[PDB]
Amino acid sequence: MADDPSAADRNVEIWKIKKLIKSLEAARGNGTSMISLIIPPKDQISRVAKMLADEFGTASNIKSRVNRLSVLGAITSVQQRLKLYNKVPPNGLVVYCGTIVTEEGKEKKVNIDFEPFKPINTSLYLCDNKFHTEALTALLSD
User: Fold this and answer.
1) Where on this protein does the Glycyl lysine isopeptide (Lys-Gly) (interchain with G-Cter in SUMO2) crosslink form?
2) In this structure, what CATH number is given to the domain that contains residue 98?
3) Cα–Cα–Cα angle for 62, 123, 84, nearest 5°?
């Protein structure tokens, strides 16, 4: 086989990422049930734990009751995925954890973890009503 980091694979990833992003675009929570976290390739998983843990503790200090809870919930999921990764993949580490709702009215949490399409030297972390696939779409958009 080839010794390339991901030659033909780069296309297969685009296939999954193409279908992955769509699944996120349809996911919508209440006030902020979508956490997007992107970690650099050279960065360490535990490293983000400090940045995340920071917002995790402050999240419990939010004036809004329903908001403070929705925040701790997603964050708790992000780190939960971090314990599954001892280090950031060759390209990087990007996990998405959040709580969305279905037409049926049932709340289903979305927890996904994977490496970016290509190396990313910029740790992007944000919480909103939708997953930010800018880092993912960056390649295709680039």
Assistant:
1) 87
2) 3.30.960.10
3) 85
